[PDB]
């Protein structure tokens, strides 16, 4: 069995292996990867997403999200309160403002030190789940808006056609920007490309492990869990890596600088901060191999979780006995 300890595996492409994106997952899959539910990708030295990124402060971001915390230091939950809409530019000068701005650090370890320490004194402003794309139309490889869509890949296996599209989102982030311990929906792939700006620190818990992660998480929040069988998916909950540790839960640990990507595999929870001001681009998609998760996948019915319109026809055909309780909570 490749990669048995589920360790991060790093890849290297050459700009051949560059162009067929699935055939280079399935390679990444051969060597393990998937087992550690998190990957990173560096691409080869001649490819580029784009040209510049001179251009982007006119970007809205109509609905700004405050990330308030609740609890203590490694275990706590946040909140999403939304502001008025600004432009990228003026997203900018706020995560640069004395308020925002990362704080003086020796190196990544420390600044990791300091989130864990001090994140849930301040509440961030994170520019969230923002349709749209930053690849210039002429990147022909990991396009991230050219990828084949799981609509596809469910009728290319399963035969089924269903509605529903798949387009990519831009975050902004800034220091103590923070996503929250999740799967992807339907324990999707997701693919994060981070365009420009400071690094974005991952956790991760391997697949195999992940029920290990859930029961700690009922432990760590018992009124959400008695809410709700699946409240992760209302990814708001936090659990610090030196709480994982003190409870021995598996899990890994990586900085994503600008320029690389990142690859999170089915069932894969994974968690994390920006270091300070950033854009990354990150969509979903699907491979055989996720066909079974997605069968499998838990679900919020209690209404929290609400998502995407495209969602629906996964519940549908993957999980018809689940679908009636599920559509009940969307509406
Ligand atoms: O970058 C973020 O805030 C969150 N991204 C992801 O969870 C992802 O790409 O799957
Ligand atoms: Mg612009
Ligand atoms: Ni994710
Ligand atoms: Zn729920």
Same mark, same amino acid.
């Given at each position: 069995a490749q990669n048995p300890n589920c360790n991060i595996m790093i890849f290297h492409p050459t700009k051949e292996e560059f162009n067929d994106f699935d055939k280079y997952?399935?390679?990444?899959?051969?060597?393990?990867?998937?087992?550690?539910?998190?990957?990173?990708?560096?691409?080869? @030295?001649?490819?580029? &997403?784009?040209? *510049?990124? /001179?251009?982007?402060?006119?970007?809205?971001?109509?609905?700004? !999200?405050?990330?308030?915390?609740?609890?203590?230091?490694?275990?706590?939950?946040?909140?999403?309160?939304?502001?008025?809409?600004?432009?990228?530019?003026?997203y900018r000068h706020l995560a640069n403002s004395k308020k925002y701005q990362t704080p003086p650090h020796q190196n990544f370890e420390d600044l990791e030190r300091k989130y864990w320490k001090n994140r849930i004194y301040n509440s961030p402003i994170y520019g969230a789940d923002i349709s749209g794309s930053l690849f210039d139309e002429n990147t022909k490889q990991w396009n991230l808006g050219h990828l084949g869509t799981i609509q596809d890949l469910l009728e290319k296996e399963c035969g089924v056609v269903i509605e529903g599209v798949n387009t990519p989102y831009l975050?902004?982030?800034?220091? @103590?920007?923070?996503? &929250?311990?999740? *799967?992807? /929906?339907?324990?999707?792939?997701?693919?994060?490309?981070?365009? !420009?700006?400071?690094?974005?620190?991952?956790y991760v818990v391997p697949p195999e492990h992940g029920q290990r992660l859930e029961r700690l998480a009922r432990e760590l929040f018992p009124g959400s869990s008695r809410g709700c069988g699946a409240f992760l998916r209302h990814k708001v909950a936090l659990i610090s890596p030196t709480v994982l540790k003190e409870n021995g839960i598996p899990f890994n640990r990586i900085t994503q600088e600008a320029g690389e990507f990142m690859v999170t595999f089915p069932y894969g929870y994974h968690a994390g901060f920006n270091h300070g001001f950033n854009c990354a681009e990150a969509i979903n998609f699907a491979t055989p191999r996720w066909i079974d998760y997605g069968k499998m996948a838990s679900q919020c019915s209690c209404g929290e979780a609400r998502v995407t319109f495209s969602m629906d026809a996964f519940v549908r055909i993957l999980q018809p006995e689940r679908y009636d309780l599920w559509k009940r909570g969307q509406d």
């Amino acid at each position: 069995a490749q990669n048995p300890n589920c360790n991060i595996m790093i890849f290297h492409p050459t700009k051949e292996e560059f162009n067929d994106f699935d055939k280079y997952i399935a390679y990444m899959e051969s060597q393990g990867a998937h087992r550690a539910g998190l990957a990173k990708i560096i691409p080869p @030295k001649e490819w580029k &997403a784009r040209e *510049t990124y /001179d251009n982007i402060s006119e970007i809205l971001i109509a609905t700004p !999200l405050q990330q308030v915390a609740s609890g203590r230091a490694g275990v706590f939950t946040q909140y999403h309160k939304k502001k008025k809409a600004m432009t990228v530019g003026e997203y900018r000068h706020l995560a640069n403002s004395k308020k925002y701005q990362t704080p003086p650090h020796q190196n990544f370890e420390d600044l990791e030190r300091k989130y864990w320490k001090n994140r849930i004194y301040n509440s961030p402003i994170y520019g969230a789940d923002i349709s749209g794309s930053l690849f210039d139309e002429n990147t022909k490889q990991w396009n991230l808006g050219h990828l084949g869509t799981i609509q596809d890949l469910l009728e290319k296996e399963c035969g089924v056609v269903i509605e529903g599209v798949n387009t990519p989102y831009l975050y902004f982030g800034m220091w @103590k920007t923070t996503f &929250a311990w999740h *799967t992807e /929906d339907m324990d999707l792939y997701s693919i994060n490309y981070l365009h !420009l700006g400071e690094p974005k620190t991952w956790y991760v818990v391997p697949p195999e492990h992940g029920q290990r992660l859930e029961r700690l998480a009922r432990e760590l929040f018992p009124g959400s869990s008695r809410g709700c069988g699946a409240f992760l998916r209302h990814k708001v909950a936090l659990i610090s890596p030196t709480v994982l540790k003190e409870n021995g839960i598996p899990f890994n640990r990586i900085t994503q600088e600008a320029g690389e990507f990142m690859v999170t595999f089915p069932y894969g929870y994974h968690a994390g901060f920006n270091h300070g001001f950033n854009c990354a681009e990150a969509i979903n998609f699907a491979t055989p191999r996720w066909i079974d998760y997605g069968k499998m996948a838990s679900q919020c019915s209690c209404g929290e979780a609400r998502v995407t319109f495209s969602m629906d026809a996964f519940v549908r055909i993957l999980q018809p006995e689940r679908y009636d309780l599920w559509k009940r909570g969307q509406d």
